[model samples]
Target: ISKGLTYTMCDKAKFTWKRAPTDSGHDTVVMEVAFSGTKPCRIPVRAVAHGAPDVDVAMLITPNPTMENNGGGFIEMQLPPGDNIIYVGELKHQWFQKG
Candidate 1:
């Protein structure tokens, strides 16, 4: 006697990047990730670095109903470079999957 399974879908993901301020006069990049879809996760965007010149970006969305939130707005992240790939973080349990 349980309810049917539900999931979230993200159609558009636009990323905006620019030069940001630093502490010791170092060069840094700030990224703004915007999503357009149903209810996205609280922490909508996540950035992970793999050593250097490789960055992993993950977008999250959920449809649990009880814990659902608006998927509008954008999320920001600070990183070294702009070379990245969109992926899912499996260990965190917030990864995106197809059903």
Candidate 2:
């Protein structure tokens, strides 16, 4: 979060998303993200939460807020059992991760 890039949890947006576990399973997965232009997206599996565990929609990041911000909504993820969840405490403004 930037001093100028501000956003709060559950900000009402012109866009949104949801997540669901495909199946319960044990593993560590870091979802790759890209703030591509005009995409209303959501956190996928292994989402880090604030004041909430195992929940993705629990937060929001909106810099220069707009319908084209490429940020929005909840994504339901599936856990088949013994699944682990982690958060990215810090992120470079621009980075690339392979899926």
Candidate 3:
């Protein structure tokens, strides 16, 4: 079951981080995660920030809130294990990691 779950979530997942210009004169960071598979289900995963010295922050995979000007943070989330689950967290940092 672990192998299948890993294949379904980790192997089939795609993560992208980018910046968007918000109306409040600040750029917002958005992280997009998508799992490309036929099976649709809820899954749990961790989205960790890289190159951050803030004690290595991380966030669980889910719809995160606005993280601003802090480089990045850590979190965990459970998502609809399919396509386009936006995990919008701290994006001002250098990079990120997902598992």
Candidate 4:
């Protein structure tokens, strides 16, 4: 596990998680990703765990059409923005459905 780094807008940002460091037992998943700056945006995350030939886990952004809106009401992160810290949490193992 890693204390994910904070990033500013420069086209795109990338993150790489180290081996699970927490003994939480529950999958070390990306529970939530937050962005605060000129605008406030909360990016929802999901857990994916598939074993076998494809044994991997990941987090993804939620699909919300309103997210595309740049209006005040919508959640938007500005470029040349201030510092933003993204907090990642662990997910319950039961959340995974193995085939």
Give the alpha carbon lDDT tens digit for every residue of 1-99 in model 4.
Answer: 211223222111221222211212332322222223322222232233333212223322222201112431111111111212221222122232211
Number of the top-ranking candidate, with lDDT as the measure: 1
TM-score of 4: 0.19
- Please give, for residues 5-94, the per-residue lDDT of candidate 1 as tens digits: 444433333222221212222332222233333444322234454443244443223221111343223322334344333222211212
Name the candidate, 1 or 3, with the larger TM-score value. Answer: 1
Q: How many residue pairs clash in model 1?
A: 0
State the lDDT of candidate 2 residue by residue for 7-64, as single tens digits.
3322222222222222213232223233332333232223433344545331222222
TM-score, structure 2 vs. true: 0.20
- Model 3 misplaced regions, further than 4 Å: 1-29, 43-45, 49-56, 60-99
Q: Which window of 10 residues has the lowest lDDT sum in candidate 1?
A: 90-99
Which whole-number lDDT from 0 to 100 does residue 88 have in model 2? 27
For lDDT, candidate 2 versus 3, the one ahead is 3
The global Cα lDDT (0 to 1) of model 2 is 0.28
* Candidate 1: clashing pairs of residues: none
Tens-digit per-residue lDDT, 15-98, candidate 3: 223432111112222343333323332233333333323332333332332222322222233322222223322222233222
- Clash statistics: count for each candidate: 0, 20, 10, 1
* lDDT of each candidate versus the true structure: 0.29, 0.28, 0.29, 0.24
